[PDB]
């Protein structure tokens, strides 16, 4: 396994709703961090992207 | 009783079915004192030796007067023979009493010393003999070296392992694949093993070695008037500077060096040559040999035959020569460590036999390269 | 005495101390005009300049 | 990469010629790889002995 996708369907922005985070797996004892965030289309509040 | 824990630890570490554990008990100062008060200190004996079996901390024919440890063992058994307390010298102890003039009847100790050897026969099993905690020098009250007590051991039938020491060792492995381990030697020490056919001559150079030696203590008692004195043997530790000893090995196929810079050479049979830590030189000679350089900057010569090299993704650089025949170098024996994964990730090695180099830490240091 | 110590892997952004310890005696002291003598010991790092 | 003396290194010692007591001296150096590379290095200490 390379990465874990984590969804936040109720993230609030004035024009977008929903957020998914890309998390590569930690190496050894290193800390776990997020690197990229995926988003839905614009103008779709409360779209629950990432449910 | 805390000795049960250490006997159990030794039994677990060696994968031993049971541990024998010769123990040596010097006469208590109370007993010798009482022998002085009574006046009959003559016929007493100062050192007594007991032997038991110990499985996980609970419970062999020996003659102290002749230097022979005779233990019986059965095939498939995998026991261990250790010395819990320093083993005394061979031979029989004798005592007398001399008038010594105004001083009242002082001088007492002497040892016959017809033999200067301890002989250990193990029988028929996969026996482990731990030759540490054995006296290697005997001296008088004047501090002069009389004899170098030497150890002779016989192996029998199965795979036998002996862990060496500073004493002059004549190890007869008998049948089976046998091993001698010099892993107790420090970093400042070294061995140089040379082959004389089927026999091995081992020259050990120990710098500031620490060795048990047996002398003669002296306890004295006044009893309201002119003094009567006694003496007794006394094992002790001391560092004797530079020591050179020449061991002899027969029917031994595997040798492990110490923590120093060793030079180990094999013969025409199949050998397991391990160097351990330090900048060791290993040469296998003829036959199909297995060669483990260990840590340090090792130079390894395989010779003829099909040889096996075992590596460990270390930080040092090694020099490896295969010789004639089809040879193999293997890097998969060891599991990668945590810091290796942290610093390098999932990258292993870059090997190229045209260039003749194997890079164990590519793009992180350029000098961790094995030349083959 | 020139003590040379070889480290096969000196890591990135890591550090260590190297103490040099021994006992002294004062039978070598020269009664010069100055009331003191300095004992200087130098430690310098080498590497493959090529 | 830099090498520096460190504070705990002995700064001062004094003695009386009428007394023959000895003393312990330590020179502590600190070595750091502040660069972006890891390399094998060698440390050389010159020690006045006699
Ligand atoms: C200093 O290093 C050079 C070069 O070493 C090579 O390149 C490095 C980056 C590293 O990968 C090393 O493992 C390489 O071997 C040494 O010069 C080489 O020496 C070897 C024998 O020791 C010889 O076979 C090569 O032809 C030499 N190459 C060159 C370009 O000179 C040099 O010996 C090192 N100096 C010291 C004092 O060790
Ligand atoms: C060196 O010694 C000092 C003593 O004050 C200590 O603080 C420091 O951590 C030491 N160096 C390393 C690398 O630990
Ligand atoms: C060094 O000197 C000190 C004080 O004189 C003493 O306590 C210590 O044992 C000495 N150490 C050695 C190794 O001589
Ligand atoms: Ca046997
Ligand atoms: Ca045998
Ligand atoms: Ca070694
Ligand atoms: Ca061989
Ligand atoms: Ca080695
Ligand atoms: Ca060979
Ligand atoms: Ca070969």
Rg (CA), chain A: 13
Q: CA neighbours within 13 Å on the CB side: how many for C5? A: 12
Instruction: List all chains that touch chain C, counting a touch as 3 or more CB pairs closer than 8 Å.
Output: B, D
- What does chain D look like in DSSP terms, one character per residue? -EEEE-TTS-------TT----EEEEEEEEEE--SS--EEEEEEEE----
Q: Alpha carbon of B319 to those of B276, B290, B293, B316, B369: distances in Å?
A: 15, 16, 10, 10, 9
Beta-carbon separation of C9 and B315 below 8 A: yes
Rg (CA), chain D: 16
Q: How far is the CA of D35 from the centre of ligand 8 (A)?
A: 30
Please tell me whether residue B10 adopts helix, strand or coil conformation: helix
Least Cα distance to B87 among B109, B69, B110 occurs for B69
Least Cα distance to D8 among D21, D25, D31, D23 occurs for D25
Alpha-carbon distance of A24 to A1, in angstroms, equals 9
Rg (CA), chain B: 25
Measured between CA atoms, the residue of chain B closest to residue C47 is: B367
Quote the distance between the C-alpha of residue B126 and its chain's center: 17
Angle formed at CA B267 by CA B262 and CA B270, multiple of 5 degrees: 100
Least Cα distance to B368 among D15, A12, D40 occurs for D40
Least Cα distance to B190 among B172, B205, B168, B174 occurs for B205
Question: Does C19 sit in the ligand 2 pocket, CB within 6 Å?
Answer: no
Beta-carbon separation of C9 and B343 below 8 A: no
- What does B258-294 look like in DSSP terms, one character per residue? -SS--EEE--SS--EEE--SSS-EEE--SSS-EEE--
B328 close to B308: Cβ distance less than 8 angstroms: yes
Beta-carbon separation of C8 and B315 below 8 A: yes
Please tell me whether residue B11 adopts helix, strand or coil conformation: helix
Q: Which two tokens stand for residue B332?
A: 């998969």
Resolution in A: 2.7
Backbone angles phi, psi at B17, to 5 degrees: -70, -40
Q: Of all protein residues, whose CA lies closest to atom 5 belonging to ligand 3?
A: D22
Is the Cβ of B341 closer than 8 Å to some Cβ of chain A?
yes
**B9 Cβ contact partners less than 8 Å away, ≥ 6 residues apart:** none
Alpha-carbon distance of B323 to B304, in angstroms, equals 6
Which residues are bridge partners to B154 per DSSP? Answer: B121, B172
Alpha-carbon distance of B304 to B150, in angstroms, equals 36
B176 close to B162: Cβ distance less than 8 angstroms: no
Alpha-carbon distance of B293 to B350, in angstroms, equals 20
**D13 Cβ contact partners less than 8 Å away, ≥ 6 residues apart:** C24, D23, D25
Alpha-carbon distance of B184 to B285, in angstroms, equals 26
B321 close to B303: Cβ distance less than 8 angstroms: no
Task: State how far residue B298 is from chain A, nearest Cα, in angstroms.
Answer: 30
Chain C residues with CB-CB distance to B368 below 8 A: 8-9
Q: Which two tokens stand for residue B345?
A: 């990730």
Backbone angles phi, psi at B102, to 5 degrees: -60, -45
Alpha-carbon distance of B349 to B314, in angstroms, equals 11
Q: CA neighbours within 13 Å on the CB side: how many for D43? A: 24
């Amino acid at each position: 396994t390379d990465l874990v996708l984590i969804g936040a369907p109720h993230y609030y922005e004035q024009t977008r709703g929903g957020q998914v985070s890309v998390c590569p797996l930690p190496r050894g004892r290193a800390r776990w961090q997020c690197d990229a965030v995926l988003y839905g289309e614009q103008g779709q509040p409360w779209g629950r992207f990432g449910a | 009783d805390g000795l049960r824990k250490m006997l159990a630890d030794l039994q677990a570490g060696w994968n031993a079915s049971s541990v024998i554990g010769v123990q040596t008990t010097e006469i208590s100062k109370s007993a010798l004192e009482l022998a002085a008060i009574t006046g009959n200190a003559d016929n007493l004996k100062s050192v007594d030796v007991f032997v038991d079996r110990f499985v996980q901390g609970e419970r062999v024919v020996l003659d102290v007067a002749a230097g022979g440890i005779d233990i019986a063992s059965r095939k498939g058994e995998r026991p261990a023979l250790t010395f819990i307390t320093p083993l005394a010298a061979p031979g029989e102890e004798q005592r007398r009493r001399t008038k010594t003039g105004k001083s009242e009847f002082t001088t007492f100790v002497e040892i016959v010393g017809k033999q200067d050897r301890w002989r250990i026969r193990d029988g028929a099993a996969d026996t482990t003999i731990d030759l540490a905690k054995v006296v290697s020098q005997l001296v008088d009250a004047n501090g002069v070296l009389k004899h170098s007590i030497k150890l002779d051991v016989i192996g029998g039938d199965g795979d036998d392992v002996v862990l060496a020491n500073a004493s002059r060792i004549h190890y007869d492995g008998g049948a089976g694949t046998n091993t001698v381990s010099y892993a107790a030697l420090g970093r400042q020490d070294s061995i140089t093993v040379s082959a004389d056919g089927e026999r091995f001559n081992v020259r050990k150079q120990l710098n500031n070695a620490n060795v048990y030696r047996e002398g003669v203590a002296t306890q004295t008692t006044a009893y309201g008037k002119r003094t009567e004195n006694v003496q007794y043997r006394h094992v002790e530790l001391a560092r004797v500077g530079q020591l050179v000893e020449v061991d002899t090995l027969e029917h031994v196929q595997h040798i492990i060096g110490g923590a120093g810079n060793d030079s180990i050479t094999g013969n025409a049979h199949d050998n397991f040559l391990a160097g351990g830590s330090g900048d060791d030189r290993l040469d296998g000679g003829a036959g199909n040999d297995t060669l483990v350089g260990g840590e340090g900057q090792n130079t390894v010569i395989g010779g003829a035959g099909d040889d096996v090299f075992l590596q460990d993704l270390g930080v040092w650089s090694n020099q490896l020569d295969g010789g004639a025949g089809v040879d193999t170098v293997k890097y998969n024996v060891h599991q990668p460590s945590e810091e290796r994964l942290e610093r390098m990730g999932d990258t292993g090695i870059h090997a190229d036999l045209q260039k003749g180099t194997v890079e164990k830490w590519p793009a992180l240091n350029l000098f961790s390269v094995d030349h083959v | 005495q020139r003590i040379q110590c070889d480290i096969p892997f000196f890591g990135i952004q890591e550090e260590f101390n190297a103490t040099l310890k021994g006992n002294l005696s004062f039978d070598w002291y020269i009664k010069t005009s100055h009331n003191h003598l300095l004992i200087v010991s130098t430690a310098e790092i080498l590497f493959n300049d090529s | 990469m830099v090498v520096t003396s460190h504070g705990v290194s002995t700064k001062y010692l004094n003695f009386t010629a009428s007394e023959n007591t000895s003393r312990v001296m330590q020179h502590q150096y600190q070595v750091s790889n502040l660069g972006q590379r890891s390399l094998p290095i060698s440390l050389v200490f010159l020690v006045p002995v006699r």
